[PDB]
Design a protein around this ligand. Sequence first.
Ligand SMILES: [Br-]
Ligand SMILES: [Br-]
Ligand SMILES: [Br-]
Ligand SMILES: [Br-]
Ligand SMILES: [Br-]
Ligand SMILES: [Br-]
Ligand SMILES: [Br-]
Ligand SMILES: [Br-]
Lengths: 282, 271
Amino acid sequence: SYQPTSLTVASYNLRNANGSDSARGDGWGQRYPVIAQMVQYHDFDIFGTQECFLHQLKDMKEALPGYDYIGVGRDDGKDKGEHSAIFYRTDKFDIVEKGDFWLSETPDVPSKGWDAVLPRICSWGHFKCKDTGFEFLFFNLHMDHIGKKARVESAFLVQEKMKELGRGKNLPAILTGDFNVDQTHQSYDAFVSKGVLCDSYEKCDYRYALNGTFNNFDPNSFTESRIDHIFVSPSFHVKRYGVLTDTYRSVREKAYEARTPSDHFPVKVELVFDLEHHHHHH
Amino acid sequence: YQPTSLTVASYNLRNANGSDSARGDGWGQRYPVIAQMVQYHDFDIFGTQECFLHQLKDMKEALPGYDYIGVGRDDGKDKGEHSAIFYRTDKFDIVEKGDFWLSETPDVPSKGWDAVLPRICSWGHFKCKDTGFEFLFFNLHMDHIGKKARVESAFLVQEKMKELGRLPAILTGDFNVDQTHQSYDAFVSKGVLCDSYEKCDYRYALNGTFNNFDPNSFTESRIDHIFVSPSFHVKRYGVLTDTYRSVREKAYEARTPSDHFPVKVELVFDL
Ligand SMILES: [Br-]
Ligand SMILES: [Br-]
Ligand SMILES: [Br-]
Ligand SMILES: [Br-]
Ligand SMILES: [Br-]
Ligand SMILES: [Br-]
Ligand SMILES: [Br-]
Ligand SMILES: [Br-]
């Protein structure tokens, strides 16, 4: 028999480790243990991350017993630069296949695309659930902030890869990432306007959204802009969407102040997939 | 056989008053967020403190799959703050329920010992619909002034558990003082009950439990506890620091859904 599958997924920009944040009291070394606690407490089965240098990935894996990650450095396709690394529970999934492509006219080589200013990488894995055998694609990326044409072109390249990487089969896909611009933009429409993918924010049964997704390390910020998304094939049923606003505290240089674990909030989505019946038709 | 899993919580929802409202922490603004936390964080059954009847009505309306038990501490009916226990109606049946005041005369609305206000403990004998597991759930709010009252109340509560339990027990509440005080010791020093904070397999505690409506506060004091019979397996403990935003007198500021954080505890009873 074919059992339905439940998954908890997330997208979380962990913020690259740098000296400016550290000086402001938002240093990686102070933040990441809290990030790891959130992943554990909020039961992320598999999640896309953005902005991590390799040293940050190693820290996170050390802080996350039972997780591994996939995804290469965007600068040279090896250890250099920020990653779009995907973390997953090794006791829950096997990797059937994994890869990376750059968001450009030449996706196989580290390169800037169209009008973008930095190279940008999408990392992916074809996963298989150890319990139910359910197979799916999980993509993760971080879009360019300057190149509008690049963002739009990127959206369609990702959709082409979603088909290509099925290897002849119709594999359901989950796409996470930092998309840099909000839901009013053309590159957002590029994913959803034809119903190839659905925004979990829009399709969830239950929405818990006390904020948008960027906070700029400001624990008082508010916006309705969402720049971190989880898009899914319409064959998934989206049960619940949450933005996690959890904060820790630091001593004010006893007086304390709220600190955000990263300069984004994680987006957490709970999905169900019915192997027998998962088609939509109107 | 199948074991039983429960998510329980304790949450002081803060009495509705005009001072909080003027400061921008008004009940009408807070409770929709509190209700969302209850739902998003999957509370199966939770103890509340400080609610007047009207606040309980608001909560029941915002939580259509829930009902509550517990009477007002002023008159034993509808008047005064409650120690109301909310529960998912699709997960539990109520076998029996009751309330007692934390005093030398537990049967009637009354102040105890050196306490300055009447304090009530409300309880239910619940039966899980999936497994048939039965247990007691107690919930209270201790006095802020009466030290002897707090200590005596701890033993009275344990006495009532013995009487009624004669059923594994869970006890939630705002105990007003922290883990360094004698009334805390009175609960745990003999192994009758265990502090979820200490016994949990996994601890998520980015703060203590009281915040005074200050989104920047920090303390190692925990004044809200979930104590459980030793027979429970405590899987995980969390203090939920979620915050919403209000327009600053646009510019925004963080707001806490109440002046305490909820304590959420995931339990398993196996065998
Ligand atoms: Br590195
Ligand atoms: Br699974
Ligand atoms: Br765009
Ligand atoms: Br912002
Ligand atoms: Br479909
Ligand atoms: Br009332
Ligand atoms: Br509900
Ligand atoms: Br005491």
